[PDB]
């Protein structure tokens, strides 16, 4: 049994990371301007 509040907070951060990875890619990848 894994406490729900932990499941969300871990999956929560997990979402902020990957989406934040996307925002970084806006200044580096092909989606850049440099």
């Amino acid at each position: 049994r894994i406490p729900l509040w932990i499941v969300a907070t871990v999956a929560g951060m997990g979402v902020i990371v990957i989406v934040g990875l996307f925002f970084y890619g806006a200044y580096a990848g092909l989606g850049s301007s440099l």
Binding site: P3, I6, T9, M13
Partner: peptide
């Protein structure tokens, strides 16, 4: 170069100071 090491610790710090409280059960 990679200060993501910082964020990581200070980030899990938040839920830690209440997780330890779920362990020591009290005052939530």
């Amino acid at each position: 170069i990679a200060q993501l090491t910082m964020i990581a610790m200070i980030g899990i710090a938040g839920p830690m100071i209440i997780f330890l409280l779920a362990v020591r059960r009290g005052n939530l």
